[PDB]
Amino acid sequence: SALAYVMLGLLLSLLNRLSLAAEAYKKAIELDPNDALAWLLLGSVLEKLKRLDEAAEAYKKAIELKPNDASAWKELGKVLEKLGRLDEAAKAYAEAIKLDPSDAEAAKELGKVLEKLGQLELAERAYQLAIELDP
């Protein structure tokens, strides 16, 4: 049942019925407070529902569970960049690159957060890391 509610939430996510899918994941979290998959999914659902403050909380609970998704840290960077904690987001994009230095997206998006935060030198070094990767 812990799995089945996650599978329900994914199906509802496929029909754009986003808020109903968030209800399903949360019932799978009551079922199993450690289904880190249900946590990461709930974060990307709230990010689209634009409950960005509640979204970053679920992403942090997912990273707390499985501490080494470059997927999860990169996704917490999107939420914290939109939410406005631009330095807490660069620290998150950093952890994501500490885990996969081939992540072309996480390098591009760290140079964009840094270009807005000030340090063009630190950003220009990140921009060229991303361009180095993908063609």
């Binding site: 950093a94 500490k98 230095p101 390098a107 630190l122």
Partner: protein, 201 residues
């Protein structure tokens, strides 16, 4: 130890002005994923910085003393608790001194002759100083006559050419200002931006 240079592949040539300034920048570098930190002795009372960073030997960092010009400077470096001794020049007195205390010593070299004399003293791992003059053509030229010498250049290593050095055959690289220049949070970012660039070549 040697393997510890092939593992972490980067050495923080840390220069500073005060003892509190130096403790900050080493902490920032270590949070950035760089575990080989070379505390130069041009930092006033560096023999106390290395004994005051002793808690990072638990966290998994190798703290050593760099730019060591006299063997009596090397005494304060060994007694502080440094785990490797680095010098920009080949001083056979310091090599005897380090062999006999049981400390790894990395001498400074620039010429073929300077390397042979350092080889006769037992070393096969040298610092190549200053790298911005010899260049990676040097490292690739010594691959033939001396197939045993492994190099760790310093000065002349930035992220535009850090893959050039490695794909010529260096063991690790030391970075000075292009890793430590900046606020103790900028420095942590410069480390992950550099330790990632290395993990690509």
């Amino acid at each position: 130890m040697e393997e510890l240079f092939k593992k972490h592949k980067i050495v923080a040539v840390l220069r500073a002005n005060s003892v509190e300034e130096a403790k900050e920048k080493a902490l920032a570098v270590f949070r950035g994923g760089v575990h080989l930190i070379e505390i130069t002795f041009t930092v006033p009372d560096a023999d106390t910085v290395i004994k005051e960073l002793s808690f990072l030997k638990e966290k998994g960092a190798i703290i050593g003393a760099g730019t060591v010009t006299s063997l009596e400077q090397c005494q304060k470096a060994v007694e502080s608790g440094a785990e490797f001794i680095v010098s920009p020049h080949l001083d056979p007195e310091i090599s005897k001194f380090c062999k006999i205390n049981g400390v790894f010593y990395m001498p400074g070299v620039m010429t073929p002759t300077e390397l042979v004399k350092a080889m006769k003293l037992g070393h096969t791992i040298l610092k190549l100083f200053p790298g911005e003059v010899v260049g990676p053509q040097f490292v690739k030229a010594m691959k033939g006559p001396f197939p045993n010498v492994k190099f760790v250049p310093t000065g002349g290593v930035n992220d535009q050419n850090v893959c050039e050095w490695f794909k010529a055959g260096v063991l690790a690289v030391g970075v000075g200002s292009a890793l430590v220049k900046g606020t103790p949070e900028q420095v942590e970012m410069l480390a992950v931006l550099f330790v990632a660039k290395i993990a690509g070549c």
